[PDB]
Amino acid sequence: GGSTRNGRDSEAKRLGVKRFGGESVLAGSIIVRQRGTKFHAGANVGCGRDHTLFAKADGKVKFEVKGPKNRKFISIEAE
Amino acid sequence: PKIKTVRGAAKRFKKTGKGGFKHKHANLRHILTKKATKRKRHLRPKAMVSKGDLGLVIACLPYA
Amino acid sequence: GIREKIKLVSSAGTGHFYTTTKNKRTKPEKLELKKFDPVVRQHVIYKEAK
Amino acid sequence: GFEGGQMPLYRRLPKFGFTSRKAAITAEIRLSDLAKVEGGVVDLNTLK
RNA sequence: UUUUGUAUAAUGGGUCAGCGACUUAUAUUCUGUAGCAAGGUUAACCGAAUAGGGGAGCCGAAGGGAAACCGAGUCUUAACU
RNA sequence: AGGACCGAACCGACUAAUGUUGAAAAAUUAGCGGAUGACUUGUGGCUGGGGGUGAAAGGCCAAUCAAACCGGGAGAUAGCU
RNA sequence: UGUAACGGGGCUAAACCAUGCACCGAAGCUGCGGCAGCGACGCUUAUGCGUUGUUGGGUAGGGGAGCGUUCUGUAAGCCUG
RNA sequence: GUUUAUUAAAAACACAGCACUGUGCAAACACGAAAGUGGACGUAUACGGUGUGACGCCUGCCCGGUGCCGGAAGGUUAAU
RNA sequence: UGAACUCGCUGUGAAGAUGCAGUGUACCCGCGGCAAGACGGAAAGACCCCGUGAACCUUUACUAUAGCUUGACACUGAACA
RNA sequence: CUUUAAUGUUUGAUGUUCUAACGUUGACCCGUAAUCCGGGUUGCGGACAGUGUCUGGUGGGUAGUUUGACUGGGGCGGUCUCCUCCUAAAGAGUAACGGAGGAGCACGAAGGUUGGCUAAUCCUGGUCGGACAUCAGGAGGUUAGUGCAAUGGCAUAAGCCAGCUUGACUGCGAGCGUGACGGCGCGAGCAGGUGCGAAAGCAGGUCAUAGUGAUCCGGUGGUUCUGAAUGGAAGGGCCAUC
Incomplete structure (x- = not known):
């Protein structure tokens, strides 16, 4: 394989930054190989098989500096 | 000379009243067991061209 | 296609087969896998791949 | 159809x-056609 | 004329006077305007003749569906959804 | 007796000066190879462009050659000056 | 290759460093004459006058609008021995 | 001797002699909507064709690979 | 053969300028010669490279065929080993 | 059901012989005291040959055509689609023939669901024991492990272990993420039915990302949408597939 081969981009993005928006549902996060390093609060679910922090009700994103470790809380609630 | 409808488009599309062309779409003829079940449940219903994707198609289909 | 695909019929044999990703190339094992028969819309036993 | 490649x-x-081949032998009318017809009956028999 | 850049020992000028290189129909989409408008238009052709006549055909006015089949509705199917 | 052999014409165009919009589509000058022969030359004719003719050179074929001349297909074709 | 590693002279201060006030310094700023466009304020609705404000170098391409040239009609007219 | 018209004039090409594979005559060989004609008015001591290279005297090895001849022992096997 | 009444050095440089900047020099026009220049005048570089271009040549690469050949067939009848 | 001969016989081949098919590079006569040629008379060959024709084989002798791209030039080597980390700039967009490892498949479990558990490594003790394996104790550890590369998570484990078990589900889908698009990735939830759990509750596989060719063609199994005069049929369309 490499060098080079490089493994170009790997589809890696940050997506959810600041208050954000969605019509009725939203992803909350997209960052891969992530389970509980960003923890679920409000109208969402914890990250697993698809790496998203998916929210089933229209909400605005709120970010905490602390959680159970590490494991900082990412809150999604209606405004 | 009377201007010809292109065979490449004429035998692949169905017309409408409001505009846009209706068609069966690809990926539903060849080796079905190897393809995803959710994908096969999404390709079973037929597809359509909307007015924003239509200019390229009437450049092959001139007539009513 | 190096997968030699198998197709089974329901307990009653009626309608079409059920095509499955279950392999026969690599291991001899039980072919009964219990699947949906859409003439009865019920989960039933499936038989004979020939 | 050419778009560079x-x-x-x-x-x-x-x-x-x-193909269906019936449209070229099919007519389409609105309620204000064949509406008087000299008091006679509308049937598609022998139009020639 | 060209090029990142040419006074360029780069391609081109000896001179007077002339020559020397872009058509519109069939089909169509949007635009402009003209006649008429849910209608508009006849082709070839007849004709007193460029008047009048010629609506076959064409486009538009109602769609959905592989099609059969339904219609301001309609397809998909066990399908209400 | 002899494709012996010297030497002109006769057939060539090897040496050096010269020419190459020339005396010239290759000869002006003096030499040089062959010089009754597998020689040359006057007259008449035969073999024809995917076809001839070469002790046969990718030589020659009427100013034209890894393929002659003419008009027509023809305003071939040119992601280019 | 020859004045030729401030272009050169002057200059042991007329160089070097930074300091204090003055002056010179564009086609622009700014004043005026003129024009087109956008918009106000005062007077007036042939429609202008008065004042203030403001934009006006534009090439691949996208829009707006004149002056000549020729034919055809006007032209049984108008100019001409 | 022959020679590449105007850039090598020869170690290039050509006759000698040798070898080999074909060819029984309506030969093999050759050009051709195909006669016909050339081979030849010739006869295997003749003729075709490819090598090598006058002369004197000579010419070691390999048949697995390439081609060709007979078989297809053994394989693979068309048409109809 | 655009305009020519075409000096040397050094700088500037599509950087190897007669011609832009500075500086040293130079009577004008001929003629018979001299020959360091005017990248002299001649050739819309020949060199090499790029090109899914074109051609020729290698060849059981792809495709078609002349000729060869088993079979089927027409001229076509009868017998025996 | 063997291997084979003769009696009978189907169909070929080689050879001989006859000649009511066809050849004569045989002669003579007539045209005509014509070494062209036809006719005429007579000999010799003979289904061999000859000429054309169709299907298979062979066959540059002849004619047309093809022979991908990158490569800080050519050439040996590297490379063209898919995974992963740094280069990569503390939004967005991202390069090199820069630094460095992999894929073109496997698994019926390493799965689903309910209930339990926790590593590495080193020393000492111990033995069928010239060196691995299983263990006991002590120090020490979310550093072991995960079907495979790499990457990060992972104990409330997604790492291994037992019961039951196959959701490696059908039909639908609000949509959510992405690239210029084709196309790629993720999917709430509804409806059908089965499975786990005492139950609240949960299951559209695997710890996630690579494991694969758009379409045209024809085949394969159902249907009764179509089907040139029309009742069947051929062929197509749908349904289900290769």
Whole structure:
């Protein structure tokens, strides 16, 4: 394989930054190989098989500096 | 000379009243067991061209 | 296609087969896998791949 | 169909056959046609 | 004329006077305007003749569906959804 | 007796000066190879462009050659000056 | 290759460093004459006058609008021995 | 001797002699909508064709690979 | 053969300028010669490279065929080993 | 059901012989005291040959055509689609023939669901024991492990272990993420039915990302949508597939 081969981009993005928006549902996060390093609060679910922090009700994103470790809380609630 | 409808488009599309062309779409003829079940449940219903994707198609289909 | 695909019929044999990703190339094992028969819309036993 | 490369779009898509051949022998009328007809009966018998 | 850049020992000028290189129909989409408008238009052709006549055909006015089949509705199917 | 052999014409165009919009589509000058022969030359004719003719050179074929001349297909074709 | 590693002279201060006030310094700023466009304020609705404000170098391409040239009609007219 | 018209004039090409594979005569060989004609008015001591190279005297090895001849022992096997 | 009444050095430089900047020099026009220049005048570089271009040549690469050949067939009848 | 001969016989081949098919590079006569040629008379060959024709084989002798791209030039080597980390700039967009490892498949479990558990490594003790394996104790550890590369998570484990078990589900889908598009990735939830759990509750596989060719063609199995005069049929369309 490499060098080079490089493994170009790997589809890696940050997506959810600041208050954000969605019509009725939203992803909350997209960052891969992530389970509980960003923890679920409000109208969402914890990250697993698809790496998203998916929210089933229209909400605005709120970010905490602390959680159970590490494991900082990412809150999604209606405004 | 009377201007010809292109065979490449004429035998692949169905017309409408409001505009846009209706068609069966690809990926539903060849080796079905190897393809995803959710994908096969999404390709079973037929597809359509909307007015924003239509200019390229009437450049092959001139007539009513 | 190096997968030699198998197709089974329901307990009653009626309608079409059920095509499955279950392999026969690599291991001899039980072919009964219990699947949906859409003439009865019920989960039933499936038989004979020939 | 040419768009610089990567093939014309219609060459990716499946064919549609099975013709019906009745439209060229079918008429379409609104309620204000054949509406008087000298008091007679509307039937498609022997139009020639 | 060209080029990142040419006074360029780069391609081109000896001179007077002339020559020397872009058509519109069939089909169509949007635009402009003209006649008429849910209608508009006849082709070839007849004709006193460029008047009048010629609506076959064409486009538009109602769609959905592989098609059969339904219609301001309609397809998909066990399908209400 | 002899494709012996010297030497002109006769057939060539090897040496050096010269010419190459020339005396010239290759000869002006003096030499040089062959010089009754597998020689040359006057007259008449035969073999024809995917076809001839070469002790046969990718030589020659009427100013034209890894393929002659003419008009027509023809305003071939040119992602280019 | 020859004045030729401030272009050169002057200059042991007329160089070097930074300091204090003055002056010179564009086609622009700014004043005026003129024009087109956008918009106000005062007077007036042939429609202008008065004042203030403001934009006006534009090439691949996208829009607006004149002056000549020729034919055809005007032209049974108008100019001409 | 022959020679590449105007850039090598020869170690290039050509006759000698040798070898080999074909060819029984309506030969093999050759050009041709095909007669016909050339081979030849010739006869295997003749003729075709490819090598090598006058002369004197000579010419070691390999048949697995390539081609060709007979078989297809053994394989693979068309048409109809 | 655009305009020519075409000096040397050094700088500037599509950087190897007669011609832009500075500086040293130079009577004008001929003629018979001299020959360091005017990248002299001649050749819309020949060199090499790029090109899915064109051609020729290698060849059981792809495709078609002349000729060869088993079979089927027409001229076509009868017998025996 | 063997291997084979003769009696009978189907169909070929080689050879001989006859000649009511066809050849004569045989002669003579007439045209005509014509070494062209036809006719005429007579000999010799003979289904061999000859000429054309169709299907298979062979066959540059002849004619047309093809022979991908990158490569800080050519050439040996590297490379063209898919995974992963740094280069990569503390939004967005991202390069090199820069630094460095992999894929073109496997698994019926390493799965679903309910209930339990926790590593590495080193020393000492111990033995069928010239060196691995299983263990006991002590120090020490979310550093072991995960079907495979790499990457990060992972104990409330997604790492291994037992019961039951196959959701490695059908039909639908609001949509959510992405690239210029084709196309790629993720999917709430509804409806059908089965499975786990005492139950609240949960299951559209695997710890996630690579494991694969758009379409045209024809085949394969159902249907009764179509089907040139029309009742069947051929062929197509749908349904289900290769």
